[PDB]
Structures are given as C-alpha cells and as structure tokens.
Motif scaffolding. Sequence first.
Motif, mmCIF file in Angstrom:
data_model
loop_
_atom_site.group_PDB
_atom_site.id
_atom_site.type_symbol
_atom_site.label_atom_id
_atom_site.label_comp_id
_atom_site.label_asym_id
_atom_site.label_seq_id
_atom_site.Cartn_x
_atom_site.Cartn_y
_atom_site.Cartn_z
ATOM 1 N N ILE A 46 0.820 -1.238 0.000
ATOM 2 C CA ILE A 46 0.000 0.000 0.000
ATOM 3 C C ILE A 46 0.833 1.258 0.000
ATOM 4 C CG2 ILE A 46 -2.022 -1.162 1.050
ATOM 5 C CD1 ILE A 46 -1.116 0.036 3.804
ATOM 6 N N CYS A 76 -2.962 5.989 14.950
ATOM 7 C CA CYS A 76 -3.209 4.562 14.746
ATOM 8 C C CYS A 76 -2.797 3.789 15.986
ATOM 9 C CB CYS A 76 -2.404 4.060 13.536
ATOM 10 S SG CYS A 76 -2.750 4.866 11.988
ATOM 11 N N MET A 96 0.578 -1.576 12.944
ATOM 12 C CA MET A 96 -0.333 -0.610 13.543
ATOM 13 C C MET A 96 -1.674 -0.646 12.808
ATOM 14 S SD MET A 96 2.004 0.547 11.307
ATOM 15 C CE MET A 96 2.398 1.631 9.912
ATOM 16 N N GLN A 97 -2.679 0.021 13.394
ATOM 17 C CA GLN A 97 -4.043 0.003 12.839
ATOM 18 C C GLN A 97 -4.077 0.533 11.397
ATOM 19 O OE1 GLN A 97 -6.315 2.704 15.085
ATOM 20 N NE2 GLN A 97 -8.352 2.343 14.072
ATOM 21 N N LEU A 98 -4.705 -0.228 10.494
ATOM 22 C CA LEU A 98 -4.793 0.177 9.089
ATOM 23 C C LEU A 98 -5.931 1.177 8.889
ATOM 24 C CD1 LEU A 98 -3.909 -0.453 6.101
ATOM 25 C CD2 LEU A 98 -5.794 -2.207 6.088
ATOM 26 N N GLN A 99 -5.657 2.262 8.181
ATOM 27 C CA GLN A 99 -6.624 3.312 7.892
ATOM 28 C C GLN A 99 -7.038 3.258 6.419
ATOM 29 O OE1 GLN A 99 -7.918 4.471 10.350
ATOM 30 N NE2 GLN A 99 -6.357 4.391 12.000
ATOM 31 N N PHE A 157 6.493 6.784 0.873
ATOM 32 C CA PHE A 157 5.869 6.060 1.981
ATOM 33 C C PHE A 157 6.758 4.945 2.523
ATOM 34 C CE2 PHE A 157 2.020 7.147 -0.620
ATOM 35 C CZ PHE A 157 1.558 8.152 0.238
ATOM 36 N N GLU A 173 10.063 5.657 14.903
ATOM 37 C CA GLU A 173 8.632 5.637 14.643
ATOM 38 C C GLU A 173 7.893 4.828 15.706
ATOM 39 O OE1 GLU A 173 6.745 5.889 11.037
ATOM 40 O OE2 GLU A 173 8.489 5.454 9.796
ATOM 41 N N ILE A 213 5.414 -0.378 2.926
ATOM 42 C CA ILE A 213 4.331 -0.580 3.882
ATOM 43 C C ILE A 213 3.240 -1.405 3.212
ATOM 44 C CG2 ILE A 213 3.646 1.862 3.361
ATOM 45 C CD1 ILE A 213 2.345 1.965 6.243
ATOM 46 N N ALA A 254 -1.772 -2.519 9.208
ATOM 47 C CA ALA A 254 -0.658 -1.965 8.439
ATOM 48 C C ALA A 254 0.658 -2.482 9.025
ATOM 49 C CB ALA A 254 -0.668 -0.395 8.465
ATOM 50 N N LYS A 311 4.882 -1.886 8.323
ATOM 51 C CA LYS A 311 5.924 -1.140 7.630
ATOM 52 C C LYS A 311 7.275 -1.753 7.949
ATOM 53 C CE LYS A 311 7.783 3.586 6.966
ATOM 54 N NZ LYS A 311 7.496 5.044 7.328
ATOM 55 N N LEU A 343 -0.265 10.099 10.000
ATOM 56 C CA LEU A 343 0.553 8.957 9.551
ATOM 57 C C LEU A 343 2.004 9.388 9.378
ATOM 58 C CD1 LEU A 343 -1.805 7.860 6.546
ATOM 59 C CD2 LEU A 343 -2.031 7.181 9.028
ATOM 60 N N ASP A 344 2.909 8.409 9.400
ATOM 61 C CA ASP A 344 4.312 8.453 9.001
ATOM 62 C C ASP A 344 5.165 9.336 9.897
ATOM 63 O OD1 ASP A 344 6.865 8.447 7.689
ATOM 64 O OD2 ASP A 344 6.015 8.181 5.721
ATOM 65 N N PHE A 345 5.812 8.721 10.890
ATOM 66 C CA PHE A 345 6.701 9.432 11.808
ATOM 67 C C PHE A 345 8.171 9.318 11.411
ATOM 68 C CE2 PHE A 345 2.918 8.151 14.227
ATOM 69 C CZ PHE A 345 2.362 9.406 14.275
HETATM 70 C C1 DTQ Z 1 -4.578 2.684 2.774
HETATM 71 O O1 DTQ Z 1 -3.252 3.305 2.723
HETATM 72 C C2 DTQ Z 1 -2.508 3.500 3.913
HETATM 73 C C3 DTQ Z 1 -3.115 3.076 5.129
HETATM 74 C C4 DTQ Z 1 -2.384 3.240 6.364
HETATM 75 N N1 DTQ Z 1 -2.854 2.869 7.605
HETATM 76 C C5 DTQ Z 1 -2.066 3.047 8.726
HETATM 77 N N2 DTQ Z 1 -0.807 3.623 8.626
HETATM 78 C C6 DTQ Z 1 -0.432 4.024 7.388
HETATM 79 N N3 DTQ Z 1 0.872 4.608 7.582
HETATM 80 C C7 DTQ Z 1 1.747 4.907 8.721
HETATM 81 C C8 DTQ Z 1 1.269 5.083 10.022
HETATM 82 C C9 DTQ Z 1 2.207 5.311 11.046
HETATM 83 C C10 DTQ Z 1 3.536 5.302 10.737
HETATM 84 C C11 DTQ Z 1 3.985 5.098 9.419
HETATM 85 O O2 DTQ Z 1 5.337 5.132 9.190
HETATM 86 C C12 DTQ Z 1 3.072 4.866 8.395
HETATM 87 C C13 DTQ Z 1 -1.163 3.825 6.263
HETATM 88 C C14 DTQ Z 1 -0.535 4.244 5.029
HETATM 89 C C15 DTQ Z 1 -1.273 4.056 3.873
HETATM 90 O O3 DTQ Z 1 -0.874 4.388 2.570
HETATM 91 C C16 DTQ Z 1 0.509 4.708 2.441
#
Ligand code: DTQ
Length: 292
Positions: free
Chosen positions: A20, A71, A87-90, A25, A57, A28, A41, A43, A155-157
């Motif tokens: 995804i 998440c 972690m929880q998928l969004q 990104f 992260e 992940i 999710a 990563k 998202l994304d630390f």
């Molecule tokens: C449906 O698509 C996505 C769904 C996601 N759900 C949760 N985290 C994501 N990312 C995240 C959360 C915390 C830390 C980190 O490094 C990354 C996501 C990223 C997505 O797309 C890139």
Amino acid sequence: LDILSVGILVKERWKVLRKIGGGGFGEIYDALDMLTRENVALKVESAQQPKQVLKMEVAVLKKLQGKDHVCRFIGCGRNDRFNYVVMQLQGRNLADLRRSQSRGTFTISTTLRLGRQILESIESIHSVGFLHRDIKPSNFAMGRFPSTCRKCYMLDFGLARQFTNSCGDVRPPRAVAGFRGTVRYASINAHRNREMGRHDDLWSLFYMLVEFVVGQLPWRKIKDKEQVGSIKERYDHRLMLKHLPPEFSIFLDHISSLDYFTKPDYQLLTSVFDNSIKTFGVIESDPFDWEK
Ligand SMILES: COc1cc2ncnc(Nc3cccc(O)c3)c2cc1OC
C-alpha cells in the motif's frame, strides 16, 4: 529493492497481503493479523540500512498511544534482516481524497473540519515532545469503517524529531539542520536549514488548508528546492487569506510571530476553527465532500 513480498509471514502472525505504500511512503503493506483476524498496516525497513528510522517511529507511536487521531500500536520487531512496525490500518489519504474530487478542491466545511482535526493531532504529537516535520495531505487518512471513517489520522513518523530533552525543556537548536520534509509544504525555516520547531508543523498545516480550498499553492510548478524557498521568503502570505474565513488572519499572524523557542497558542488557533465553523453553520454530522 523491497525486503518483503506479498505472501511473507512475519513472526508467524502477520501475513503480508498487499503493498500500500512505496516511494516516499517506504515499504508498507496491508497484512492479515492471524491472531485477531483483521487487516493491519505493517511497515518494514532493512536492518542493514545506514539510516534506520523505524526505531523512532515505534517510540513515537508508543508515546502517542491513547491519543485521538493516531493509529493503534500493534507490534514491532527487529532481526538481522529487517525491522518492522505493525499498527491500525486506515483508509483513503487526503491527497487521494482531494485529487478524487475532480475539481481538486474541498469546500470550506470539509476544510475546516479536517483542519481542526489535523490541528488536534499536531498539538498531540508536540505534547509528547516530538515534531512531525512532514505535515502534508498524504500523511493524513480517514478511517475505513463506519465508526472511524469520519475521523482523520496522522501517519508516518519517519521524519519526526524529539524537540524536548530528558527534563521536558526545549532542546537547544542546532546551528544548521538539513532540510526535512516535502518541498511543497515546508516552511521557510526548513528552506533556510534552520532547526525546525512546533510552528513549522503549523506552517505546513496552513499551506495544506490553502491548497485544500484553492486547489494549488503558488510554487506548485517549481521543483528546485532553492527556487521554492526564495518564493516563500518573499511571498505575502496575506494573499492566501482571500479564500479562507476571516479569522484565519489571526491564525496567520499568530504563526508568523512564532519562532523555535515560542510555544504556539494552540487554544487561539483552535478558536479560529471553532469560530469559523460556527460562522459558516457547519455541523459535524454534515457530509464530507467525498460523502456527496
Ligand atoms: C490505505 O493506505 C494506507 C493506510 C495506512 N494505515 C495506517 N498507517 C499508514 N501509515 C503509517 C502510520 C504510522 C507510521 C507510518 O510510518 C506509516 C497507512 C498508510 C497508507 O498508505 C501509504
């Protein structure tokens, strides 16, 4: 090269199902959690990579557990080949939602409600001592279920930095700090290679909100980082107030007054959203633009 592939089982528990995120990104996936029978999710990063950031992260995700707009942390590990976090998928991210609006803009009602939620998540990460440093629309996503789809998640630390020390005081800034983040949303301070502060995350929020309502930023077609920075340095940001509710003059004047050493008046910035939502008659139950 990717370190995992679809079908891999991690820790005899998380079955990797679908990639995804790639590019910025990182690597992940949507994975199947066999313990709870749900998609999560996952990563990953190589454990032999020079700059490895998942350790931080994980620390940020754990420090944020229990906050709204984050998440849920599910797990992590480290072996000789890779590090991972679960972690929880969004659901759909805001860059995807805006671009899927066809006119590529959000209404004021959707913009104010998303912006208030993002401001909440920014105050929250600062409150645990970290700067996000890459605030931008693809780093925020809505939930994927009826009970979460009206909630926006940070998202994304991977580019975060702890800005407080052992005690909790602001740490002394470095004299020079290499540019961090995405050129389009970066504050002038990132362009100047200064140590980023809490106000720089808020500058990135201001640019996101402008882009939501107008559809583009003035430096949209400019790719050179230095050319973009020169534009932002000279730009009269009051031009961006034209399409925002009137109290965003207060928002812009406040963040323009801040520096690394000044805690933002989050309550003031929140009142800009609250007062605007009230003036425009926005109700939380109203549909978001993508729900029309
Ligand atoms: C449906 O698509 C996505 C769904 C996601 N759900 C949760 N985290 C994501 N990312 C995240 C959360 C915390 C830390 C980190 O490094 C990354 C996501 C990223 C997505 O797309 C890139």
